[PDB]
Amino acid sequence: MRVVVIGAGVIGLSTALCIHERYHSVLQPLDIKVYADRFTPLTTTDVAAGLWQPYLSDPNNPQEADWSQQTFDYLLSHVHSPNAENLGLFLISGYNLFHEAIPDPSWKDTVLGFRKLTPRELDMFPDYGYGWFHTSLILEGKNYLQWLTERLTERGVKFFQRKVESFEEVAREGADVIVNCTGVWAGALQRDPLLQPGRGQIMKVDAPWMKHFILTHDPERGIYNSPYIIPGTQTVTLGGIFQLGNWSELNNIQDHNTIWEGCCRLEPTLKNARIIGERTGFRPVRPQIRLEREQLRTGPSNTEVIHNYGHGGYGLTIHWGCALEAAKLFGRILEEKKLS
Amino acid sequence: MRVVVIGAGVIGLSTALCIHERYHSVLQPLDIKVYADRFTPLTTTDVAAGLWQPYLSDPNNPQEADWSQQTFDYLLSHVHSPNAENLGLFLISGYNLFHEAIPDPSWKDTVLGFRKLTPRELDMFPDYGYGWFHTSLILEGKNYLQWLTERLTERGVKFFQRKVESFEEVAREGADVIVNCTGVWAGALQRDPLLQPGRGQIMKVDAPWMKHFILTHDPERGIYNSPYIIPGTQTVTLGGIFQLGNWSELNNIQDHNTIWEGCCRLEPTLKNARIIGERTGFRPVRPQIRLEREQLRTGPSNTEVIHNYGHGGYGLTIHWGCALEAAKLFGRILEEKKLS
Ligand SMILES: Cc1cc2nc3c(=O)[nH]c(=O)nc-3n(C[C@H](O)[C@H](O)[C@H](O)COP(=O)(O)OP(=O)(O)OC[C@H]3O[C@@H](n4cnc5c(N)ncnc54)[C@H](O)[C@@H]3O)c2cc1C
Ligand SMILES: Cc1cc2nc3c(=O)[nH]c(=O)nc-3n(C[C@H](O)[C@H](O)[C@H](O)COP(=O)(O)OP(=O)(O)OC[C@H]3O[C@@H](n4cnc5c(N)ncnc54)[C@H](O)[C@@H]3O)c2cc1C
Ligand SMILES: O=C(O)c1cc2sccc2[nH]1
Ligand SMILES: O=C(O)c1cc2sccc2[nH]1
Numbered sequence: 001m002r003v004v005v006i007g008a009g010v011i012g013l014s015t016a017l018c019i020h021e022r023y024h025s026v027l028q029p030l031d032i033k034v035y036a037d038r039f040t041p042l043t044t045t046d047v048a049a050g051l052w053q054p055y056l057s058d059p060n061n062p063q064e065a066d067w068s069q070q071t072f073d074y075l076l077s078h079v080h081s082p083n084a085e086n087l088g089l090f091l092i093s094g095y096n097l098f099h100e101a102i103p104d105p106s107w108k109d110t111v112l113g114f115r116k117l118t119p120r121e122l123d124m125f126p127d128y129g130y131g132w133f134h135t136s137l138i139l140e141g142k143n144y145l146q147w148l149t150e151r152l153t154e155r156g157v158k159f160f161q162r163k164v165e166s167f168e169e170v171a172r173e174g175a176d177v178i179v180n181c182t183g184v185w186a187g188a189l190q191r192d193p194l195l196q197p198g199r200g201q202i203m204k205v206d207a208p209w210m211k212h213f214i215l216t217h218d219p220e221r222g223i224y225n226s227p228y229i230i231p232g233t234q235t236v237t238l239g240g241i242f243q244l245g246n247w248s249e250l251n252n253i254q255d256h257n258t259i260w261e262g263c264c265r266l267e268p269t270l271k272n273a274r275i276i277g278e279r280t281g282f283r284p285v286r287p288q289i290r291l292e293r294e295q296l297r298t299g300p301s302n303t304e305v306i307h308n309y310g311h312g313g314y315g316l317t318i319h320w321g322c323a324l325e326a327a328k329l330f331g332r333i334l335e336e337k338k339l340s
Numbered sequence: 341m342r343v344v345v346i347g348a349g350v351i352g353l354s355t356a357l358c359i360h361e362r363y364h365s366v367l368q369p370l371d372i373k374v375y376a377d378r379f380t381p382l383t384t385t386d387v388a389a390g391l392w393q394p395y396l397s398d399p400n401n402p403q404e405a406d407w408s409q410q411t412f413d414y415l416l417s418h419v420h421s422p423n424a425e426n427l428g429l430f431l432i433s434g435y436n437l438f439h440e441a442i443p444d445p446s447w448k449d450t451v452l453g454f455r456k457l458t459p460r461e462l463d464m465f466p467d468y469g470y471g472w473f474h475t476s477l478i479l480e481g482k483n484y485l486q487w488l489t490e491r492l493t494e495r496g497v498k499f500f501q502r503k504v505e506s507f508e509e510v511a512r513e514g515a516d517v518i519v520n521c522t523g524v525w526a527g528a529l530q531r532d533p534l535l536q537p538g539r540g541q542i543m544k545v546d547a548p549w550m551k552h553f554i555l556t557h558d559p560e561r562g563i564y565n566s567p568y569i570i571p572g573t574q575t576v577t578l579g580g581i582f583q584l585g586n587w588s589e590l591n592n593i594q595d596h597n598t599i600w601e602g603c604c605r606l607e608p609t610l611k612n613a614r615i616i617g618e619r620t621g622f623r624p625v626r627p628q629i630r631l632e633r634e635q636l637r638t639g640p641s642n643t644e645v646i647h648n649y650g651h652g653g654y655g656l657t658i659h660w661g662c663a664l665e666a667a668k669l670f671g672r673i674l675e676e677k678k679l680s
Contacts, residue, residue, distance in 0.1 A: 080464060084609050090549040093433045112461050113473055121452050121475070124419065124431075133453055133475075135433075135461070209430035209573050211551050233549045268420045269430075 001030050002174050003330075006164050006189070007181030008036035009045040010141060010319045011308050013148040015179055018323035019330050020155050034152070035170070037163045037185075040145035044183055045315065047202060047281030049230035049237040050088060050139040051213055052317045055223070056105050060288040067289075067321025069110045074320045075137050088143025092231065093135040094213030095121075097128035102217070111136050127265070128216065136213075139316050140232055164189065167296060171303040177333055178296075178305045179326065184284040186309045192290070195310055198283030199246035200224065201255040203238040203263075207273035210236050214266060224283070224313050227262035235276055238263045242313075244285065251278050286310030291322055293329050304333045341370050341674070344515040346504050346529075348376030349383035350481060350659045351648050352521035353488035358663035359519070359670045360495050368674055374492065375510070377503040377525075380485035384523055385655065387542060387621030389570035389577035390428065390480040391553060392657045395563075396445045401628045407661025409450050414660045415477050426490075428483025428573065433475040434553030435461075437468035442557075451476050467605070468556065476553070479656050480572055504529065507636055511643040517673055518636075519646045519666065524624040526649045532630070535650055538623030539586035540564065541595040543578040543603075546614040550576045554606055564623070564653045567602035575616050578603040582653070584625060591618045626650030631662055633669050644673045 005016045016034055024030045040046055052075065054068040079089055095117065108114045112135035122129060149159070164170060167178055167189055182189060184197050210231045218226040224242035231237075240262055241255045256278060264270045289310045296303040308326050311318055345356040356374055364370045380386055392415065394408040418424060419431055435457065448454040452475035462471060489499070504510060507529055510518055522529060524537050550571045558566040564582035571577075580602055581595050596618065604610045626649075634645040648666050651658060674680040 080608050082608055082611050085549060085612055090551065090609075092551045113455070113458055115453065115455065118453055120416075135473075208548070209425065209428075211430065211432045211571065231551065268422065269424050271422070272425050 005179040012181030014323040045141040070321035088140025198285035199243035201241040347521035349385040354663040385481040410661035428480030538625035539583035544575040
């Protein structure tokens with residue numbers, strides 16, 4: 001009963017934990033190893049603000065809306081716990097700004113107190129003429145990743161610093177089940193032309209008077225490419241850079257400018273806020289998440305592979321529902337093998 | 341014209357600013373001095389969290405609701421102003437929690453996006469069965485008082501550290517108009533049987549993940565005597581203590597425990613918060629604010645006095661509408677001295 005999880009971002013970590021809680025037994029022990037090239041604070045998960053917000057429009061797969069709703073409901077149950085702070089979990093309200101009356105999102109009833117913005121509220125954002133206000137949740141990846149690791153290490157899970165070259169390399173060493181949570185890099189283990197980097201740049205600023213998230217939406221700039229302000233526990237994330245096919249890990253100076261000028265125009269009080277840091281990450285962009293089983297067609301034994309990658313700009317938002325689905329796929333592997 | 345403003349809390353400073361910006365001219369040159377025994381951070385204004393919220397039910401004087409509304413409208417028009425950070429001015433959303441249903445407040449349309457709490461939002465507060473959600477403003481005194489002081493200084497207003505023994509002592513040194521903004525200590529200059537300290541105690545805690553205010557209402561505890569959580573710029577104010585007639589300036593453990601126990605039950609995450617500081621202050625409690633002119637008959641001349649005190653637990657909420665009214669009374673004085 002040897003299981004190897006490839007990846008230590010929110011995907012692999014929550015998957016490892018979910019499989020362990022649901023399938024570990026002293027009767028039938030479950031050996032679980034996590035192999036990863038990069039760990040916290042150096043994953044894509046660490047670059048995220050951690051705000052819960054799926055895409056505005058209905059997903060290519062309606063199963064994704066269920067996975068996001070299951071994640072919200074799960075995080076909402078731990079929000080008023082003493083453990084909440086160790087997770088990087090907290091409630092936050094905020095604004096979604098538009099230039100037109102776009103349709104209501106499928107998640108209007110999952111979030112708390114969703115409503116349209118009133119005239120006086122919109123008078124605060126002269127560049128926008130429609131929007132929403134609701135209460136959502138922030139799950140900060142750097143705390144959540146450390147918390148998941150702590151809970152994994154105490155459940156018997158060993159962590160290994162390694163760049164996996166092939167699934168067959170892992171299959172050869174005895175892995176019965178391979179959990180593929182490689183994010184944006186998955187194409188290195190198996191070609192997937194639907195998987196692309198969604199290059200992102202963010203600024204971390206000191207603006208503690210900022211109690212609300214502010215997200216803007218422009219068709220001319222596209223998804224995740226217009227100003228956003230997201231207050232964290234210690235700092236405020238400034239963003240709004242999406243570049244499909246861009247693999248540059250360096251901080252582009254025109255992007256730094258776009259972030260600064262766009263966010264200051266959105267919220268003039270940012271102009272006097274102290275810039276703390278700047279980061280680049282690659283969103284694992286895909287028309288839909290890949291969350292399925294694959295029987296390896298290489299080597300003398302067939303190896304069971306659970307793929308869990310391609311969560312684009314909403315991995316923190318959907319991680320739990322995806323972890324639970326991967327655990328379901330895992331139990332299906334267990335039954336098909338044998339009972340007695 | 342020689343003006344002496346007694347008091348350097350929010351009332352004294354905003355009145356002095358409002359009078360100077362409206363009346364100092366070539367036609368009416370004003371010599372304004374401010375006398376105060378205590379300056380920031382040692383005034384009642386400094387103990388306050390600075391949240392804008394008047395009384396729920398219609399005031400004894402309907403003028404008070406107009407004065408609070410004028411204050412919110414003025415502060416709201418500056419929320420994105422270059423000076424907002426210097427003022428300590430920012431937007432904040434939050435909860436007003438009740439055991440039973442209560443009528444909508446007279447200010448429901450002054451605040452932003454006022455509405456009732458939904459069942460899912462109410463499930464987060466088991467001890468309460470009814471509530472509101474709205475967006476208001478915080479104006480922090482430690483910043484606001486220093487901002488008003490800098491504004492008065494550039495206008496040529498002179499500040500003196502002194503404990504005024506009597507209005508006559510001021511009148512005898514040449515004051516034409518005395519603006520009495522002495523807060524809870526006004527009785528020492530002229531007996532006021534309707535003025536009492538509304539003793540308050542607060543804790544300032546490090547809980548930066550707290551993004552909303554939470555105010556609880558209990559008619560058995562009375563006004564300002566039920567737990568409240570008010571996130572500021574650097575710290576979160578924990579309070580909920582009102583002791584009518586208590587002149588003790590010391591912080592006490594009983595009140596420390598009431599605050600801590602009450603606010604931790606409301607928000608379990610507070611258990612792990614670091615306590616930064618604790619303060620005691622005296623709300624200037626009266627059945628209504630005394631904002632009126634008086635011709636003082638103590639000495640060879642009559643001195644024109646403007647009283648502006650008795651703002652209770654809502655001095656920050658109402659200060660600007662009161663400062664504008666004091667200025668109108670000041671104009672009536674100049675108009676009588678046959679020089680306007
Ligand atoms: C700028 C920006 C802002 C964002 N904001 C939000 C937000 O507010 N809310 C939200 O829900 N989402 C947000 N996201 C998306 C979120 O960051 C990602 O969807 C989530 O981090 C992807 O999770 P992951 O586990 O798949 O990838 P990662 O965190 O990238 O983990 C991939 C893991 O796979 C490992 N790995 C890959 N290949 C191999 C190999 N061959 N061998 C060994 N290890 C390997 C890596 O080392 C790493 O451990 C944001 C993204 C960006 C870029
Ligand atoms: C615990 C607590 C929390 C609160 N929270 C809020 C809130 O969130 N929002 C809100 O709107 N309000 C709040 N308040 C109300 C606000 O603090 C007071 O209404 C406002 O501070 C009253 O201001 P003031 O100018 O009249 O008095 P103060 O701020 O006390 O200043 C009185 C001034 O007069 C001076 N003075 C008095 N007598 C003399 C004399 N004889 N000679 C020389 N100088 C003299 C003092 O030295 C001082 O400079 C709160 C109050 C308390 C106690
Ligand atoms: O840039 C992103 O990928 C991103 C910004 C926000 S705000 C909520 C989710 C999310 N994702
Ligand atoms: O304790 C007080 O006097 C007080 C608490 C709050 S919250 C808004 C006003 C106000 N006043």
